Amino acid sequence: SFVEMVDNLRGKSGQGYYVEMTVGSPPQTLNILVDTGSSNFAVGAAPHPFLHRYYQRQLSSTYRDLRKGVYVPYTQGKWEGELGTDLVSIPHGPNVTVRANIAAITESDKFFINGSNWEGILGLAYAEIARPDDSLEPFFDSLVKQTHVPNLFSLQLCGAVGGSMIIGGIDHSLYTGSLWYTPIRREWYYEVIIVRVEINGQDLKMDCKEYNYDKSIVDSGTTNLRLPKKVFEAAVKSIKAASSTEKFPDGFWLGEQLVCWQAGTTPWNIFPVISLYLMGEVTNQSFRITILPQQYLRPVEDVATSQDDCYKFAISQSSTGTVMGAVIMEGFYVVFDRARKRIGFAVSACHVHDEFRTAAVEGPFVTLDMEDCGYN
Template sequence: MNIVWRFILNILAFMMVAGDIPFDKIDKSVKIHKYSLYRVHKWKENNFQNAPSELSTRIDRMRGFPDIGYAIHITVGTPGQQFNALVDTGSSNFAIAASPNAGVPSYYHSRRSSTFQNRSQQVTVQYGKGTWTGDLMSDIVHLDVGFNRAIRQDFSGTPTKTFFDQLVDKTGIANIFSLTLYGPVLSKGLSWTSKDSNYGGEMTFGGIDRTLFLGHVYYTPVIKKWYYEVKLLNISVDGKPITMCCHGYEKYVTFVDSGTTEIVVPPAVFRTIVHSLQKFIQAPKLFWEGREVICPAGLGIAWSSLPIIEFTLPLAGVDGVLAYESSRFNLAISPQQYIRLSETVRNLGFPCYTFSISPSSNDAPVIILGDALMEGYTVVFDRINNQVGFAVSRFAAKNLTVSPGINRLERVKNGSLNIQNISSSSEDSVAIVSVVLASISLFMTCISIGVMTCIYFNHHRNKSSNDYPYRQVSSPHHPPAYSNAEEQYGSRDNSLADNGPTESD
């Protein structure tokens, strides 16, 4: 069993505070506030750490190769101590390293902060594999995102309103946020598509920024609010469903988790996926196990020849319009999402790739829709209606050879096809606060636990009705997922907003 140290920080966990936040400083006439973040790397195996300040281009034989996550930059304490905060929708605690360790380049010094308060309480968190333990404490956290200056992360026995609740109450923004993660991609000539290699996407508070995606937002219900748990109905490879015995996928808990780089599936499903892909691509066993990279020379990988992998979810609605009962939709991910470009490893100038699907452990029946899947979409976390939405990312559609897609499925009865008319709703007339993300590990949860815990490295964590057939609905508004972006969306590219991503951005 690999021991995984993970620096975990929950943005929404900032939000348990005592006292008022200075929202009067907000310029409410400005609807979108952007904050530049930093691209850093985390180690694939030993990654309970702040991201390293310098990017490594080598493979560490002990720790594997650097992995990409998504983070924001924060300061903690007075004077402020800087950290890279992993934004993770699959965690609920604000935890920070507070003692030296070989895998941690910097840590929180409580004695150097004049605003530090010790709560004299120990906290232990148990995961599917591994635990961590730390001391409960309080200090000032600064997140420079326009609406937020400095707030105290206070954890007394008296419940207080979360940061996000105060933000909603005092600014009138909607109780919703979204993530658009930009995975590493190559443009023509094997160069990075972004001028600034640190740029890794956007995070939006209070509404939806429609310049970031194409088409509609397809929502699936959150079945448990503790985390963003959704119901997965099926997984298909190249149009062929992978069936499971004994209650199928229902016995697995499925999370939408920005803190996990890979897509995690049941072991039997993993073996079927690998067996299917081995017909198309020759790679050593260690590649499929996630322990080696492949670096094809010449023209590289023929992406259009590789199969699409689809994840089927219940459809709650599209752009606010309720769907018929038992409607479904498929998230069709591109081969460039499950065979992911390594940003840090090259071989004689040729790009290298990692396999971004891994099996869950037998004692942890979970399915994780991690960054590898999320990077194809804008993912909307609608806390008002308890649902998670997906829309095809403009960045992914424009920069990937094979675009990700979304296919809507409707129930067919007596040979007829029920198709619901869908119209795009106007953009929410609320204040929208956007945060520019850097490609690094980050996390957020549906419910914030109000815990700032200092970890002293004596702990570890490894985070790791069907009576009738269904038929795909194809229309100009619901194109098949497998086409190239130019074929799929045509002239839509001409309507890109000035602040939308382009090949040169």
């Protein structure tokens, strides 16, 4: 019955992907952003310039107040509100209704985005990082405890129609080839371990611990592929060298300045492919996912005469570890197998195409001492 969930997501990498949900009785419809980087379920419950609609506790007869305040700060953006519970359903998801914790957002700062179309956020990470503390059971945890929905979900994010969030399973019609699994190192963020990095087949030759300093996570709520300072610099130096025959504006490599080319003349060939090797399921075994430039060059509308193809560098620097964002997830079908503490990757049915190259998930590879790649 997963067909009912296929294509249940809308949005793009730049402003996030959202799924339709209902809260309260009678059911109040709201678009909720899918965020594997947090664990709080929260919805705007007060007027805001960027909100076209919001949760009205006053209109719900099943709403219950927890008499507790709460706030959640994010890498970028933050909000505060009042905790409480209510009945939640997912129209284009499993046919069930559960009473889950809900944070009613009363104030926010740089959280809501202009024209994103979503009015709330669905934190799918573990309770360990939920605010105020891990006693506030996350939505997914509530779903699995109150129903027979299997403890796992998968995400097929499609860039530029929309995507799919299969709750409770894996839909084989959404991917090609084999699924490759990497262990979820620890149950807080969806933390993984990168054991090797290559650009155009060239090893970055860095201590693999640098790749996971201070950690590496899979986050649908982040647009870019964010890398620790050391790694980011080496990657840019390598990417620049690969496309040195091209001239780019100032601030382009900072994910700031936009770059354009004549309609259909984007020189993809000058941009290298990036291979991220992830810890595997068996001893001394890893597998790699390959990213095409079509993934790390996020298409953006031309500020003026919208005619040419413009893009923004979708690889940026981080100070809180590696973040495998949407631009990376878009090329694949990602399975968040909570039940077996692992994350699977497979080429997505909606992968972006290239003439002489193709994104891929390949294995097995032998990699010794992978455990030393983890940061402590």
